[PDB]
Design a protein around this nucleic acid. Structure first.
Ligand code: ATP
Ligand code: MG
Ligand code: ZN
Ligand code: ZN
Ligand code: ZN
Lengths: 559, 43, 114, 264, 65, 180, 158, 196, 86, 133, 160
RNA sequence: AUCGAGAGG
């Protein structure tokens, strides 16, 4: 299991990783010292030898250098040591171990080996600082948010191996996921928030900024966009520069909300020929989701165009955002006093309803659903009341939160944040759930030693009215801590179980392969599937679409 | 240093989960993270 | 360890050309100038003066990476205006303005009594 | 007086000068301020060799502290950068050398001040390398406090430097910029829960400019010609010299570009 | 361990002030903030370097060697 | 703290004993110790089972009898609704551990992040002791200019964290600047 | 209506409309007969498996059946003319593009399906976060273990 | 990492002139992304910045003690008396442009700690290396200049990519490649071969 | 057991080269170019063996026989020139 | 070099919309029953009133890089206050003898009605909108 | 349930449906009762469905259960991936466990079985078995270090 | 080595 299946391997490097927007997604930033340590054997060739002479001259300390030269006899020549290294002739049929060079294929991997996508080949770009650099987008298949994340790079030692990595393991080839038939990588973080903000009609770009952004697109048409507004002043909408970034010839249609062609809400999107007619850019268009722009670009234009597009969008949007800026801030957590009073009245109403249901239980005059114990029914109804109360409180807050506040902006982009986070910070965190239950009395009849005996009221049970900004009472904090402890246990438990599972699945299914007859067979050749996936087709290149005959009136179908 | 000096280790029916009895005697939130979480606690 | 020196950003090494000039592709008069061992603060100034001149159609400044102090400026000029000439005129204009400000400030300081 | 940018100084102090600059392109004010922090050259110790250190502070820590201490740089233009200069490690024109040896004789904890530092390299009649003390006592910045019975012996060599290489060389700590105080340009949209005016304080720089009339429309063309600025000087280089040197350094950079084009 | 020379954000020297400031708070029984104002360390970052700083050097000085 | 009936059921310790404690504390006369409180009987030691028998109040103010505007920001507190409390807890913060005591506002923050900071703080660099230059430990890391925290828990002065800080009060801006 | 579909017809049609700059006023050049016959011909020239065995041909016909239905829905003679004024050439181009896209869509022989399937389960399963049923990782463990014991057995009676 | 839950690597060192500057001129020692905070759900980091700014301008020490009654509105009022925004949202000028940033940026004094873990210690690169004799495999760890482990699950990702040769070169040439002579007749490597 | 020939007229296999087949062919040709074995195609401006192999495949200059294989083990052979690449 | 269509319109409604700088404009044709216009205008750029009459013109001309205005080189293609450039997202018929025209200028949206001007409205994407006081 | 059925017009309309949910499963007895549709009835346990209705119904239920888990996440996995596991258990007449019981016990190969669990016991029995390993399996090939007949390795490449 | 402890993801 530990030596034959897995082997500690030569030419393996690891570093703390940090994310660089300028670096293209396909490239990995390789710290110079590691590249200098790492060697790839290259046979001398007539074209190769002249470059390689100079690289050997530059030597081990400075890349492009060569740690070793390999004779036809192959007795090792150590370059750093060798006196002859000053005077060596390169010869032919002799293999020079080049220092690792830019635009050379490597494999970059996050320790979760759950996915083939998690190990992806990258172009080498040698960078001075010590941290491996990677694009912001490429983080998502890697599942690495690199506060301290460490990633491992393996360098091919053979040209056939290099060809296999480049021809099949490249990031562009792995953009569109085999599973879930959606792109793995999407625009992330400030690029998404800023793309939404840039796309708003309210946002407008001056000609100087326009020229800088045009320049920022690595490939520009060279033709200044005609001003969206000319006569009062030459103005350019943010969508037009972003459209200059969009690859020409690409058409996107998106309708989710009432998306009239007029589209006053500006929901949904029309791009025609890489030029976007209507909409505000949202997460799904720019997202990993199928029907996202990335899926369309990857299939329509090929993978390389898609990866470059990733880069270009990131540069233009990040520049724009840097000009506008962004800050989360305390006041996005702060909520209007009128809305806060409505919030408190909502919580009070839920409390009175809980007491009334409890009183009816105390009367023993109750309706118990069949197959439900009466205590079970009471607890379920009360739990539902508290859950509905927290959700409703958050919804009132969400309406109260203005368009300008930044947490809503992050959520509207979909970059980061969710309604539940808004609700818990704003109004009410909700009832703590332990073992699928409201907080128990460890002491008989008391949830807390402070709490009185036989209290089934929500405060004893630990549903926390208080906002995070408002602050939490001590009892509430302890209840939250109990729930969190259970959550962390379950996190680690789930990981361990998934490790055992995933290994079992892989070991069972490793033998099974598509064969040339298209039978899907194990090593013995027992046919699991006569045609793989019951369609005989690759999971890639499959997008969900509507089937028109099904649905609608029969008269509508005939008409 | 101080935290290492005050440590509780439980050899190993839900020990990890915070108990109502634990309140006021053990820190609610100081616990190992990862395997053996909640087994060990700081007074 | 791996990190480069502050001086390397500061000064030209290995005979780096301070200015490299290459033709732009797809714009007739445009030309790209790679300033080397140069920083943003000069580049935005050069570009602003280039924008001011009527004859230059395009002026933009871009840096490939924060790590390396290489600054690229591209200028497209009207026909009959050399791009390099345009850049010269803009730079000279900046120098004239700077001298005027220094003289005015010196007079003002002499007026100031503290 | 001169056509072009005209500057009126609100306040003159040796530490700081507050001025109003009009008819200036903003990118030029920003360019000058970034030059003023970074490009102005000043002399600070680049090398410290310690003979013996008995103090509790480690030698690297002390050397760093020494690097931050201000050294007068009025005549720093006369001084030549060591990399520019022909000498080996140091010539007297490029390097000003300061030695300090302090022994904790006093039962009271000894204090080591900038005033104790002394120069061993010939001035040649230029005002360079004198430690600057603004303290009323004249007691220098404390490099180290010495226990009784503790002696530290070090020599220091000061070479020309620029702030882009290191923070100590930058003459000016703080530079204050205000433009469009009324927000007539509306470059920035204020975040207000209820009202923008109450949440954001009115700047003093707003008051100089006439308050915008409510009726007039916003003009897209206008770019602010007037900025309000203040410079704070360590005093290794005086304020007036500091701003003039920032201007001059920008001119020198532009001239280097122009000459590079001519050579091309 | 020792008073920082300069506020890292500003770069303005803070080494000279510290001794006076200590005496100052005892001399007038002044609140610390007014003493910072008298020092002229108006920037809250400059103030921060002083208020947050502690001199552990005295503790190291107590050790006899 | 022990609470027993007098008129209204009141904490046993009262103001005067605190004033004497603080007077002895300022001296550094009549000696007042925690053992003196226990000999006085104002404070008692309770095991978990005894705790099951006892009924306790978080706040000393809650026990005193309560007889209308309230600031909105204040955390909603359920009224105790209990006539009799055997004892009153000294402070909620005391249930929190040392690492929890370090966290500025656990009360205003999520529990899992409080746990994570507890984990990180042991890893975080600080000056371990004044004796370090004399000491020879295998690995030691000491901050160049250690700075006391701007916001301090009342617990920290007992913890000595302020005296031997592990952090720098960096000016921190929340912004999007070129995606780093 | 939405199902995973081998080729996105609507994208091909939209791309055709912009490519050929089609106008609605001009009548379609295309014979009604040629629309129907060309759709049938496109259906004929898609092979999941090469060669002719009656069982192999039949397994292909079963295999292509849903895709054939999608194509018939997407292109009807009436629909072809109404939705767009397809030049006969743009219809032939659509036909060629659909065939080529399906050929790209066929799985390359030798791809290891099972390892991909296991990983494809695994990443959701790693991220998988836990009216009452056995749910999530415990439920999955029961399914994989084929254990007789069910923590929450349930029968759905209709 | 902060005193609150969030931790991070420094992606870059920016000179002060590049960094955005308030009218006062304070340059943040540290810039953090907004997007991290909402999912972290730690309000107290923001609260600590506000309280520390109030405390620094007043010069008074600021108490964050848990379960002690504190008004964010009160702290905001104190900041208003200082004149700083109740939000602490600060008008900022973009460094390279000198232009005012369109959106004002939160600026606060935040306590932060330096984590023990450091890149320079952590990095290990081994092109070729010492081999533990019996396995013939790479040794383990930076100290022994050890080769990183290739997971069997990692091998599974590679099989899913389908490249037999990369896995083969990692599996034999990179680690414990070996040549032997096995006797055909015995079916077993009874044969020992003198090549000389 | 032996001589499990598949007639060249009677081959059924995907005419398109498997991406694995293209990768292996390109890598083998690139190994030969690194080996400095003679290159049939006219070469303009590329050192790298893989770029040359890609051009040679587009040229179809690469002579190689790819044995399409079946679970039964009858071997069908498709010349690189025969196989469609796209 | 001929304007494709010229119209005189009276604006029924100004809607601030979600965006403050860009307001929606609902406008009814003058002397035509069947022509209706819904536009996105910038109020900061253009003063608007709840009731107002503004001349509306669409021109094919007065690709090419937008050339910065040189006053001597520039002849005003229009004396009109407001000009936008954009492409029609769709040309549709709400009713027979009632063509509806949809033109977008950098996402800013335009709705037009009637078959009298559909011959005036053209298939070519390029359009210039001219608004006069 | 609130399930949707075709209307007389054929537009898909929704009709409320009455259902029953049973704590226990006794499939054979429940199916032979009045008032139920024998066709419609389902058991959450895959094994009961398989025993009553045959192996193919069991495989359908297996995919349904896996789908319910993935849907509880809201994640989506393409039908082929789930299907392959379901079919691997299904193709063996008895439903086959992912665990070593069954999966490792399937005869084909010796090393593919040995890798997962109980390695040495498998090898001991195989030694008594005198098992011959094709070594075709991927894990087996990795143990050999010989190139696996996998992806690029599988097809032979010969000169013209 | 071995064993343990601890810690990072
Ligand atoms: N899948 C996710 N969805 C939403 N937010 C996430 C997700 N993963 C991380 N975050 C957020 O990103 C920030 C930092 O990540 P987080 O603290 O959750 O890391 P972690 O869970 O410890 O990492 P890991 O995924 O490596 O186990 C927090 O704001 C967190 O809420
Ligand atoms: Mg992480
Ligand atoms: Zn010299
Ligand atoms: Zn400061
Ligand atoms: Zn033998």
């Amino acid at each position: 299991r530990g030596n034959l299946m897995g082997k500690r391997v030569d030419f393996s490097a690891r570093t703390v990783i940090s994310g660089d927007p300028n670096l293209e997604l396909d490239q990995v930033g390789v710290p110079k010292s590691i590249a200098k340590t790492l060697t790839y054997p290259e046979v001398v060739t007539p074209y190769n030898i002249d470059r390689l002479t100079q690289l050997v001259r530059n030597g081990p300390n400075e890349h492009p250098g060569a740690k070793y030269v390999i004779r036809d006899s192959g007795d090792r020549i150590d370059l750093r040591y060798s006196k002859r290294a000053g005077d060596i002739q390169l010869q032919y049929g002799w293999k020079v171990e080049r220092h690792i060079m830019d635009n050379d294929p490597v494999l970059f991997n996050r320790q979760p080996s759950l996915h083939k996508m998690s190990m992806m080949a990258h172009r080498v770009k040698v960078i001075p600082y010590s941290t491996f650099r990677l694009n912001l987008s490429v983080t998502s298949p890697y599942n690495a948010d690199f506060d301290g994340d460490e990633m491992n790079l393996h360098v091919p030692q053979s040209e056939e191996t290099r060809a296999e990595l480049s021809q099949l393991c490249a990031v562009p080839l792995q953009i569109v996921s085999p599973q879930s038939n959606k792109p793995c990588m999407g625009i992330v973080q400030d690029t998404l928030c800023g793309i939404r903000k840039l796309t708003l009609r309210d946002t407008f770009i001056e000609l100087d900024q326009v020229l800088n952004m045009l320049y920022w697109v690595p490939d520009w048409d060279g033709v200044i966009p005609t001003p969206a507004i000319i006569k009062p002043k030459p103005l350019w909408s943010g969508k037009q520069i972003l459209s200059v970034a969009i690859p020409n010839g690409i058409h996107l249609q998106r309708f989710d909300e009432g998306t009239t062609l007029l589209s006053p809400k500006d929901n949904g999107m029309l791009i025609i020929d890489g030029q976007i007619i209507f909409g505000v850019v949202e997460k799904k268009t720019v997202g990993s989701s199928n029907g996202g722009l990335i899926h369309v670009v990857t299939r329509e234009k090929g993978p390389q165009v898609c990866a470059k597009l990733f880069g270009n969008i990131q540069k233009v949007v990040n520049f724009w955002l840097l000009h506008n800026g962004f800050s989360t801030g305390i006041g996005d957590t702060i909520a209007d006093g009128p809305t806060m009073r409505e919030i408190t009245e909502t919580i009070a109403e839920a409390k009175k309803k809980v007491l009334d249901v409890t009183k009816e239980a105390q009367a023993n005059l109750l309706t118990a659903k069949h197959g439900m114990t009466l205590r079970e029914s009471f607890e379920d109804n009360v739990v539902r009341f508290l859950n509905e109360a927290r959700d409703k409180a958050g919804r009132l807050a969400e309406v109260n939160l203005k368009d300008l506040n930044n947490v809503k902006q992050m959520v509207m982009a979909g970059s980061k944040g969710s309604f539940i986070n808004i609700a818990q910070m704003s109004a009410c965190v909700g009832q703590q759930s332990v073992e699928g239950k409201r907080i128990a009395f460890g002491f008989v009849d008391r949830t807390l030693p402070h709490f009185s005996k036989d209290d089934y009221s929500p405060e004893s049970k630990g549903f926390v009215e208080n906002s995070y900004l408002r602050g939490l009472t001590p009892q509430e904090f302890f209840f939250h801590a109990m729930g969190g402890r259970e959550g962390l246990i379950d996190t680690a438990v789930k990981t361990a179980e998934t490790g055992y599972i995933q290994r079992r699945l892989v070991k069972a299914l490793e033998d099974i392969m598509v064969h040339y007859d298209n039978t899907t067979r194990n090593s013995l050749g027992n046919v699991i599937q006569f045609i793989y996936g019951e369609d005989g087709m690759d999971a890639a290149h499959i997008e969900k679409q509507s089937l028109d005959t099904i649905g609608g009136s029969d008269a509508a179908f005939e008409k | 240093t101080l935290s290492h000096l005050r440590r509780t280790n439980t050899p190993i029916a839900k020990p990890r989960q915070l108990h109502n009895t634990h309140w006021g005697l053990v820190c609610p939130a100081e616990t190992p993270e990862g395997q053996a979480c909640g087994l060990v606690k700081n007074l | 360890m791996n990190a480069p020196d502050r001086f390397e950003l500061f000064l030209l090494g290995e005979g780096e050309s301070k200015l490299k000039i290459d033709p732009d592709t797809k714009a007739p008069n445009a030309v790209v100038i790679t300033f080397e061992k140069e920083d943003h603060t000069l580049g935005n100034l050069i570009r602003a003066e280039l924008l001011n001149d009527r004859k230059v159609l395009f002026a933009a400044y871009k840096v490939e990476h924060p790590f390396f102090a290489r600054f690229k400026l591209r200028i497209q000029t009207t026909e009959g205006y050399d791009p390099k000439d345009a850049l010269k005129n803009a730079c000279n204009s900046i120098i004239n303005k700077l001298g005027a400000l220094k003289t005015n400030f010196e007079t003002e300081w002499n007026l100031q009594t503290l | 007086s001169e056509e072009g940018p005209q500057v009126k100084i609100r306040e003159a102090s040796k530490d700081n000068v507050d001025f109003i600059l009009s008819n200036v392109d903003l990118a030029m004010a920003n360019s000058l301020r970034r030059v003023m922090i970074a490009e102005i050259p000043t002399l600070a110790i680049d090398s410290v060799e310690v003979e013996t250190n008995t103090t509790v502070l480690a030698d690297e820590f002390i050397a760093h502290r020494l690097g931050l201490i201000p050294l007068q740089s009025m005549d720093i233009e006369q001084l030549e950068y060591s990399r520019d200069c022909f000498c080996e490690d140091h010539c007297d024109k490029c390097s000003v050398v300061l030695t300090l040896q302090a022994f904790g004789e006093s039962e009271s904890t000894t204090n080591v001040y900038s005033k104790d530092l002394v120069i061993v390299s010939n001035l040649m009649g230029r005002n360079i390398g004198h430690p600057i003390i603004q303290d009323k006592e004249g007691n220098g910045v404390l490099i180290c406090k010495l226990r009784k019975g503790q002696e530290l012996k070090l020599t220091c060599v000061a070479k020309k430097g620029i702030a882009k290489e290191h923070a100590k060389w930058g003459p000016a700590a703080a530079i204050e910029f205000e433009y469009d105080p009324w927000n007539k340009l509306k470059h920035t949209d204020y975040w207000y829960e209820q009202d923008s005016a109450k949440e954001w304080p009115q700047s003093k720089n707003c008051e100089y400019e006439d308050p915008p009339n409510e009726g007039d429309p916003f003009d897209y063309k206008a770019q602010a010609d007037t900025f309000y600025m203040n410079v704070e000087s360590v005093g290794s280089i005086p304020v007036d010299q500091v701003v003039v040197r920032g201007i001059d350094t920008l001119q020198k950079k532009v001239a280097s570009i122009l000459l590079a084009l001519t050579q091309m | 361990m020792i008073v920082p020379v300069r506020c890292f954000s500003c770069g303005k020297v803070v080494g000279d002030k510290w001794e006076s400031y200590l005496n100052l708070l005892q001399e007038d029984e002044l609140d610390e903030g007014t003493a910072l104002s008298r020092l002229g360390l108006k920037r809250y970052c400059c103030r921060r370097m002083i208020l947050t700083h502690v001199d552990l050097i005295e503790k190291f000085l107590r050790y006899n060697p | 703290f022990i609470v027993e009936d007098d008129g209204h059921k009141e904490l046993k310790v009262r103001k005067g004993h605190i004033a004497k404690l603080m007077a002895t504390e300022y001296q550094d006369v009549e000696e007042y110790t925690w053992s003196s409180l226990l000999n006085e009987g104002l404070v008692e030691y309770i095991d978990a089972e005894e705790e099951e028998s006892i009924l306790i109040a978080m706040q000393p103010e809650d026990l005193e009898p309560a007889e209308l505007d309230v600031d909105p920001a204040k955390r909603i507190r359920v009224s105790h609704h209990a006539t009799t409390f055997t004892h009153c807890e000294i402070h909620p913060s005391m249930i929190l551990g040392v690492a929890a005591s370090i966290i500025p506002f656990p009360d205003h923050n999520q529990s899992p992040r409080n746990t994570y900071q507890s984990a990180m703080g042991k890893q975080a660099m600080g000056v371990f002791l004044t004796n370090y230059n004399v000491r020879m430990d295998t690995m030691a890391n000491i901050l160049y200019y250690p700075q006391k925290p701007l916001g301090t828990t009342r617990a920290m002065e007992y913890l000595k964290f302020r005296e031997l800080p592990a952090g720098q009060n960096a000016i921190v801006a929340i912004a999007c600047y070129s995606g780093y | 209506a939405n199902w995973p579909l081998p080729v996105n017809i609507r994208r091909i049609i939209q791309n055709a409309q912009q490519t050929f700059h089609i106008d609605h006023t001009k009548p379609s050049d295309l014979t009604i007969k040629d629309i129907v016959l060309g759709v049938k011909d496109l259906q004929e020239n898609l092979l999941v498996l090469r060669g002719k065995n009656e069982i192999i041909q039949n397994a292909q016909r079963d295999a292509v059946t849903l895709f054939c239905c999608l194509l018939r829905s997407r292109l009807a003679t009436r629909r072809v003319l109404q939705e767009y004024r397809l030049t006969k050439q743009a219809f032939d181009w659509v036909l060629s593009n659909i065939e080529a896209q399906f050929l790209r869509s066929v799985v390359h022989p030798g791809e290891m399906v099972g390892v991909l399937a296991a990983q494809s389960i695994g990443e959701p399963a790693t991220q998988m976060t836990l009216k009452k049923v056995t749910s999530g990782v415990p439920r999955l463990k029961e399914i994989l273990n084929v254990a007789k014991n069910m923590k929450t057995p349930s029968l759905t009676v209709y | 990492a902060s005193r609150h839950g969030q931790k991070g690597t420094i992606g870059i060192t920016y000179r002060r002139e590049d960094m955005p500057f308030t009218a006062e001129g304070i340059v943040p020692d540290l810039i953090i992304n907004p997007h991290a905070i909402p999912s972290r759900m730690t309000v107290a980091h923001l609260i600590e910045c506000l309280l520390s700014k109030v405390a620094a301008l007043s010069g008074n020490e600021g108490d964050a003690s848990p379960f002690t009654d504190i008004t964010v509105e009160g702290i905001s009022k104190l900041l208003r008396e200082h004149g700083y925004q109740s939000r602490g949202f600060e008008v900022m000028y973009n460094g390279h442009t000198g232009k005012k940033l369109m959106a004002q940026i939160f600026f606060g004094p935040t306590y932060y700690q330096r984590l023990r873990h450091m890149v320079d210690d952590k990095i290990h690169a081994r092109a070729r290396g010492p081999m533990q004799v019996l396995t013939r495999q790479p040794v383990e760890g930076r100290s022994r200049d050890g080769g990183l482990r290739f997971g069997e699950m990692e091998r599974d990702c590679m099989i899913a990519h389908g490249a037999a040769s990369f896995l083969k070169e990692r599996l034999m040439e990179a680690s414990d490649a070996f040549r032997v002579h096995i006797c055909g007749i015995c079916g077993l490597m009874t044969v020992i071969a003198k090549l000389n | 057991l032996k001589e499990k020939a598949i007639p060249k007229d009677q081959r059924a296999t995907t005419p398109y080269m498997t991406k694995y087949e293209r990768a292996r062919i390109l890598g083998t040709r690139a190994l030969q170019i690194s080996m400095n074995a003679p290159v049939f195609v006219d070469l303009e401006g590329e050192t790298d063996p893989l770029r040359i192999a890609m051009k040679e495949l587009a040229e179809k200059k690469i002579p190689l026989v790819i044995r399409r294989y079946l679970p039964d083990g009858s071997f069908e052979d498709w010349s690189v020139e025969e196989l469609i690449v796209d | 070099s001929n304007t494709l269509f010229d119209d005189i319109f009276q604006v029924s409604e100004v809607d601030p919309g979600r965006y403050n700088k860009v307001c929606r404009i609902e406008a009814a044709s003058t002397t035509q029953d069947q022509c209706k216009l819904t536009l996105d205008i910038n109020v900061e750029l253009f003063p608007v009133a709840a009731q107002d009459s503004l001349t509306v013109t669409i021109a094919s001309s007065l690709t090419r890089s937008w050339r910065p205005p040189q006053a001597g080189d520039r002849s005003l293609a229009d004396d009109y206050d407001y000009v936008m450039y954009g492409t029609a997202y769709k040309f549709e018929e709400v009713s027979k003898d009632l063509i509806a025209v949809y033109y977008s200028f950098g996402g800013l949206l335009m709705r037009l009605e009637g078959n009298y001007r559909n011959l005036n409205n053209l298939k070519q994407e390029n359009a210039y909108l001219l608004i006069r006081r | 349930y609130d399930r949707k059925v075709p209307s007389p017009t054929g537009e898909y309309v929704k009709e409320p449906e009455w259902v029953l949910e049973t704590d226990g499963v006794n499939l054979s007895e429940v199916m032979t009762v009045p008032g139920i549709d024998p066709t419609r009835i389902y058991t959450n346990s895959f094994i009961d469905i398989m025993e009553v209705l045959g192996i193919e119904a069991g495989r359908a239920a297996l995919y349904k259960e896996v789908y319910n888990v993935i849907a509880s996440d809201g994640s989506y996995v393409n039908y082929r991936h789930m299907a392959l596991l379901v079919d691997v258990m299904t193709t063996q007449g008895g439903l086959t466990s992912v665990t070593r019981h069954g999966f490792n016990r399937s005869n084909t190969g010796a090393l593919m079985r040995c890798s997962f669990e109980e390695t040495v016991e498998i090898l001991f029995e195989a030694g008594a078995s005198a098992e011959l390993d094709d070594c075709r399996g991927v894990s087996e090939n990795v143990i050999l270090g010989q190139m696996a007949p996998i992806g690029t390795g599988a097809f032979d490449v010969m000169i013209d």
